[PDB]
Amino acid sequence: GYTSINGKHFYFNTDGIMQIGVFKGPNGFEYFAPANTDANNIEGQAILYQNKFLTLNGKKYYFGSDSKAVTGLRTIDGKKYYFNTNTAVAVTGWQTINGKKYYFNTNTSIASTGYTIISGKHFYFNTDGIMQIGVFKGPDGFEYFAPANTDANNIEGQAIRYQNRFLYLHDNIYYFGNNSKAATGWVTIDGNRYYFEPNTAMGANGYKTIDNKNFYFRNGLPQIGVFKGSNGFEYFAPANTDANNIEGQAIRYQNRFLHLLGKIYYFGNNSKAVTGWQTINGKVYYFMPDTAMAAAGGLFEIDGVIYFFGVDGVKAP
């Protein structure tokens, strides 16, 4: 093979016959440049191919900074290239590399990415080209790209007909319609108005504001209780409670109590629930920092010292 004899570059095949072109070595594939090419080089010698682009009667490859034959998955000038990593020809198509199933276009040798329809089956890939298991956006909506053998069992990475049922994956919550596609926005599913991230079908969790109105969701659904906000603790009430709001819609609620489901709170003028020791009506209350829920029903340890409260939360001294 790459056997230098008398200060040259002698390459021989399996039976040992001279070779002409670009052949493999301890450094890599090098061009046996004719005479002359660089610094008066001999015939069939390899020396310098510094930072250019090579072609050999059909095959091609890109060269990098170190003058040596660079190979692998690349992204030069915003352009991705993948020429045979350890050979002169080309390797594309599915390639399970270290657990990750990458795919490479058989035409342009570029790591196909995003919602791509391969062989009549549309998979999904991130910007790194890695196979992204999960629920991602398509021209027709969000398709669940499930593991191997699922719905009328399939292959790992192929969307499946996932109809009229919720997806838990895992903390993430979704819901698919009849069209097998995920739901987005405000969706009454079995009587219950949900809301799904238009950007990721993610059933919304946490504090939210939509069309000038605040809601505190959890698992797609707006929640009913006193939860924290951008301005502190607000009451996210049922529909109709005040100014005919909708369920779990924060509401103006100033200077007054509310008994909500075996918990109790105080709201002030601003319409936020209070926190820490507080004397209302000449009755001492302590409402938890992180809950606003009054301490009641009994013994509570507060700042290292324990207090007994009544069912109504008033500290019995």
The outline comes out as elongated
By CATH's scheme, which homologous superfamily of the largest domain applies? Cholin Binding
Count up the helices.
0
Integer count of domains: 3
Distance between the termini: 95 Å
The share of residues in extended strands comes to 25-35%
The string of secondary-structure elements, in order, is EEEEEEEEEEEEEEEEEEEEEEEEEEEEEE
Number of strands: 30
Alpha-beta content class? mainly beta
Instruction: Describe the main β-sheet briefly.
Output: 3 strands, antiparallel
- What's the CATH class label of the largest domain? Mainly Beta
Helix residue percentage = under 10%
Briefly note the CATH topology name of the largest domain. left handed beta-beta-3-solenoid
Mind telling me which CATH architecture of the largest domain this is?
Ribbon
Strand order of the largest sheet: 19-20-21
As a whole number of angstroms, the C-alpha radius of gyration is: 34 Å
Family: Belongs to the clostridial glucosylating toxin (LCGT) family.
Binding site for alpha-D-galactosyl-(1->3)-beta-D-galactosyl-(1->4)-N-acetyl-beta-D-glucosamine 2: 242, 249-252, 269-272
Cell wall-binding repeats: 1-18, 50-69, 70-89, 91-110, 112-131, 163-182, 183-202, 204-223, 254-273, 274-293, 296-315
Protein name: Toxin A
